[PDB]
Amino acid sequence: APDAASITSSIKYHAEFTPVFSPERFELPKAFFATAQSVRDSLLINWNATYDIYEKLNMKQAYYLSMEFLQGRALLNAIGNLELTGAFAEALKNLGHNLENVASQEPDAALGNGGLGRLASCFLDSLATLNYPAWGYGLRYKYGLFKQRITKDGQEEVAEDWLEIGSPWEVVRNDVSYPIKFYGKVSTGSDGKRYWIGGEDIKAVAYDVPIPGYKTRTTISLRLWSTQVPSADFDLSAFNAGEHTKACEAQANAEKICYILYPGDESEEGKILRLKQQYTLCSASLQDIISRFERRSGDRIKWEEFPEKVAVQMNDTHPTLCIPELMRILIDLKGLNWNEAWNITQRTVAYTNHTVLPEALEKWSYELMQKLLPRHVEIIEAIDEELVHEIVLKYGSMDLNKLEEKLTTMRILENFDLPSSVAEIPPKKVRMANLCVVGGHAVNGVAEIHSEIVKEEVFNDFYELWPEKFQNKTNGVTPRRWIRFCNPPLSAIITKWTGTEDWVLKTEKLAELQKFADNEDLQNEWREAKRSNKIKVVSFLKEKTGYSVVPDAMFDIQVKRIHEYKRQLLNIFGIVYRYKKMKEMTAAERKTNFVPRVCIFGGKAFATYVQAKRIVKFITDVGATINHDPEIGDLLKVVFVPDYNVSVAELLIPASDLSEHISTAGMEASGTSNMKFAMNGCIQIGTLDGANVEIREEVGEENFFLFGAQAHEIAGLRKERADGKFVPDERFEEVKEFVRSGAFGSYNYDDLIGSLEGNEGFGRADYFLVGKDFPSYIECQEKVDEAYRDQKRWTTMSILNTAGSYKFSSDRTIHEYAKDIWNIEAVEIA
Amino acid sequence: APDAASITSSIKYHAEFTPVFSPERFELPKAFFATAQSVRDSLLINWNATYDIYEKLNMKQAYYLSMEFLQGRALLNAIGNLELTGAFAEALKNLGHNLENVASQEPDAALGNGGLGRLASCFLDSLATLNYPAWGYGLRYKYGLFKQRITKDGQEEVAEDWLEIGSPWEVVRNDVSYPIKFYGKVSTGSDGKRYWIGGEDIKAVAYDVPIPGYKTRTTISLRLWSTQVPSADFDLSAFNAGEHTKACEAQANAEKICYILYPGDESEEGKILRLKQQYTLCSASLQDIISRFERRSGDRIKWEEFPEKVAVQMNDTHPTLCIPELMRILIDLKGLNWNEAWNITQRTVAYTNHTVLPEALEKWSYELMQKLLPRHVEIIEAIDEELVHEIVLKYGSMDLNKLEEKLTTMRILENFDLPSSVAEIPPKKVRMANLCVVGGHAVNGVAEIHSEIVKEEVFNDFYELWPEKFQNKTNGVTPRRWIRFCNPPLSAIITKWTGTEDWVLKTEKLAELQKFADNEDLQNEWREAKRSNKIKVVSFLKEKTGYSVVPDAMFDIQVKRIHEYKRQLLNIFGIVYRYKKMKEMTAAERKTNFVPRVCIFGGKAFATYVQAKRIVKFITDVGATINHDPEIGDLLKVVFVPDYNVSVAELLIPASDLSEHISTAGMEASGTSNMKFAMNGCIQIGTLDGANVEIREEVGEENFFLFGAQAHEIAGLRKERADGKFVPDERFEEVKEFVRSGAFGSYNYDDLIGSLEGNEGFGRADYFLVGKDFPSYIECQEKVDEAYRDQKRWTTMSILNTAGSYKFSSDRTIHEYAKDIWNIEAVEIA
């Protein structure tokens, strides 16, 4: 039970005796490392305790596979969950530092990109807090995706430095390395088994990141794979020769698998790298899982017990190769027979779907996949046949015309021949999505409506064939990271008013705030807290954007991936309109119609996506103009926060008044940031999509600004534009014109406005219905502006957003996956 | 004052809480790391204590710069010098390991190649043991030079794996990184100073290896540089594009500087890499030294005090660039004037020469050096002028004919114009050797005769000009590593007979063994010890060479770089003759004429040197034949030990009866292995060269087998061969014929014997006088064979070799450098 003085000793040791800097003085970077190593000392104890019980008990374990994890900063949650935030703060006090300054030294772990990763992370927090035996598997990416600079010219991208010094959190396990093979060829032995030989050979080495549960000892693992090759493979002959580049090739080719996340896949080179990434994750992970299976199994090792001991969850279609790979292992290596293996596979593997549109789902060149993972392609053709035969088995051959339809939809191989078939240069592809539906026992969506969409549109025929497969698992975020730790003031209020502090665990108690949403004491507290958080942000904003804003404005935040479909363009247009109106007013006329705002944008544009990058450039200029216009002062500010990541979100979210979730209706599957915002009392303006629907429902429609056409309406509305039956609002034109006037400086925005004009053509014709939804939007913003004036109302809406949150705790989501998909029971780590 | 139980705790912590392997079980690799980290815990204490006193006292510090350090294994010497070998052995006992098994897990640190490096290492041991404030600077090479496999085909080379897991000994100092610049161009500012801009920019990051003194706290540093480039330089644009190779280029180009040691320099590519290595060492090191100077200097920072506070020692001509670089810094950066700077430079920098022949000394393409380090080339031309003018100043212009001679010899630029000169496409080069003689206050050789040779041949005119420069500093080896630790049995005897244990420090007490060299008790001990060591080797030999040898033979060892001039060819020829004779004898005729031998060869052949590699292949075959010939049994064994390195030498040397040092007379500068052997009571057969001369003198000519033509005689003897006035012995032909007979199997040795035939031609005509010296050699071996029969004699020769050693302690050598070159006084670390 370590106290502050003990921890002081702890920090001092690691500072001197496990050092990574010169001995002189205790600067901040040194202090961080020492603190982190110190914390890890504890994580390792519990990691071991857990690891041991899991080995000895040999219960069923679950394995979450994801290409991305968005872990962000570890320090505060680690000490938080351990319940030592007090002792550590004190310990750093005596060492002449303060906790928040130390903690802000730590880079965000750049292991993920979007909500896909952040889901995975939250899940691990829950999995561990709830004592459920489960691990994550992922790649250990060196340079993340990219770090975002915002420059005069817009967005520039640069490689993440997170590992420049190295991560004090991770643990290398040198004795955990597996062989991964690419390319090469297959043959048959005289035992009649298949042999996959030749190609390229590389290792995959495990790195463990401990994940401590909240108020428990259960400490699980995010095990990350780093690809490499033994030093022997360095070609001394070539190097001494003079061909330095050439000598390195072997190792360069192996390590690049782990360099960056979603590498550019325009090139054939990129696509291959992608496959190599995917395969590496699956192969390495499965090998490790199986190894552990056997190990725990002693002598009485039975392969029919496998699915009762192991569950693999494929987070989206990237870990698709788990299905063929596990077959391969169970057949070629463990020497079971096909049905045995396939039954084991299906009862192990489950699929989680994340996409609404059947084209977001990934497809691979037959030629290319077959050339890289030849033994897999075999196993895939096999399953494609078996499937074809079972489609034929049901339905019958009476309909012919309809059976022809069902094959072309449901078949894993696209543009292939059937094997034997009554029938009386289009490229050959592999539909990974289809493969995932076939090989898994479960296919889940991530939100009521989305799960419905997979059942009834995306995987239509499949649902008819095997309904018992399809499910929903509505997404969530951990209340640990997203309330308890990121928002200390709100936490204090919540604890006060709900009586206990159990709400961090038993998050339903948030609902008890309901009764008090009028209470004017609680409102006064709540506003003090929300202000206090904004104060911090003002400082941040200065340091990062160079812009001094006032805390006494509405914080109007849209932070997410800078895409046309997310319609940053909409929000900023709305902002443009507000500004134009302001400029054509008297000074106290301005005051009257507009509440003071700070409109906060953040998020990353795909490096190569010319429009998205133009959008970012626009927002910065709009800002530049508005912020330095003296006619506007503090009535409106526009900032673009550079390099939005977990840590940024941990800072903006607690301090937000309004969050924008304004995608073209129906196009989002779930969302997670909305859940996070709601939890902190932020009110949401948005369209009816994803979990906007479910949040709105649960917080109450009176505490959520809704606007714009709904999902159903979209088909028709494009139709309309294409027929020339759309009439733009004249306020919409007013903006477009105003931009064209060179109003935001001398950068030319012709091309940008171009995407919003015409009735056809790939980039033209406002396909994302910004002009359409624009009236309802600015209209809805009026309502907002008004509700902000009625502070007693606004504060109730706030409080109720929080009180509605509890169902979006990832604890709930994990309890569900655990009981309705994996089937694992909580293991106590005494 | 840590005891065994404390150390047990220590090992257990580092095992669990600073781990590098899975938690399960305490295997040997895990045990090593934990022990090493444990040891380092202590090294770091003393490293800091030292570092601190050195900062506070601000006395003069010395900096030894070498391209190679041959540190070998650290564990046993670390615990040895700390005096904890007892506690650690016990601690590992309780953890269920034994010390020697643990210690044999540790790779040799692959930071050096030959004696040049091993000198440097020994020096550090002394420097630290003697409390002299001094550090080493070197590059941190990833893959060493190469690891040697011995295969059926001979020698194969492969990249060193020493860092695959990483080194538990080293300490990264992230806040110690310096800029290194290559290429680019120079200009003049309006301040009239020179500006070197553009080119390539890379970092150099310090890694510290603590070096603990014996029975002291003085723990100094071997600071190693690793070259890299910030992550920002990774080209995301290129990577996502698809040109993976291209994106990496920046970082690949920077890191390769530290990949391997003496990279192949056939190519222009290789030569540039070499220069980059050299420069990196000098620049990084000087920057660090100066930084520390300034830091200690506070306010009263005076650049005329510099040489009184700093001495740089250039180990051979590689760190030559220190001279121009230090000028550059003192001028362009610190803004002194030329004379001020040049005076500071000279009074700082000293040269150590290692070569006998004026062509072993390195020369650089003007074009290439000027293109890479343009600002240096300037400074070099400057010095070349100043020199030219001072040559002219003395001597006068009266002789013309002779002044013309003195310029072409002494000038740093080869094939250049004089500036103003009375005179009434040969490539342009820079003579680094000359530059070193000019810029330094000292030029030393490494052995009496060698130092003489530099004075009177190599740097002839220079000596006349500045005699006060030239010196000698006879080489040495540390009695810590080379007696006290590597030979525990001999150590026990030595302590017994010399009364104290002070002989590890006060190594002159070895001479007291003299009086007892007859004493038959001491002989009995001595032989038991030497046998005990051989026992270990028998085991080793089996495991590595696959050959079971008997301990009850003479151990006849030639371990050094496999070159024609070292004449491995001679020894093996001698071996061939012995074998032929044996085969033409009766069984007890064999017994009568030949003592049982195990002839041990080891050492590395330059990868590309076709003859050297053929030689190695020969020795293995000779072995193969002799070892499995049942007519020979245990009378003769020939083994080639693969991958000779410090650790191997620590094992063979204690167990040796006779060591071979049989270079073509006069060609060696010093040698160190001979010193090591002598110390362990090994008797030496050798030619009169290097320190063979000085060892022979000191142990006594009656305890050293000498043979073959002397230095003076060599010129004449080549002359003779070239005139066709050489007559080969018919025993020499007997061997050649015997080989040609296909006697050693079916590999063809025509080309090999070829080098030994003819009177001219580059590879032909036995230029190394193997045939010449062959009679005296085999003759001398007879004497040996005989003296081995007279065990009382043999054991006295042994004992006296040890008693003669004391003067070859590197303590002596360092005391001398310290007082007669650097001028530093012992600093007590209370």
Residue numbers in the entry:
A (entry chain A), B (entry chain A): 23 to 446, 511 to 916
List sentences from the manuscript:
The most significant structural difference between the Pho1 and Pho2 forms is a 78-residue-long peptide insertion in the middle of Pho1, termed the L78 segment. The stPho1ΔL78 structure reveals that activation of the enzyme occurs through the proteolytic degradation of the L78 segment and the association of the two remaining protein segments to form the active enzyme.
The free structure was solved from two different crystal forms that belonged in space groups P3121 and C2. In P3121, there is one stPho1ΔL78 molecule in the asymmetric unit, whereas in C2, there are three. stPho1ΔL78 structures from the two different crystal forms are almost identical, and since the structure from the crystal that belonged to P3121 was resolved at higher resolution (2.2 Å), we focused our analysis to this structure. stPho1 is composed by 916 residues.
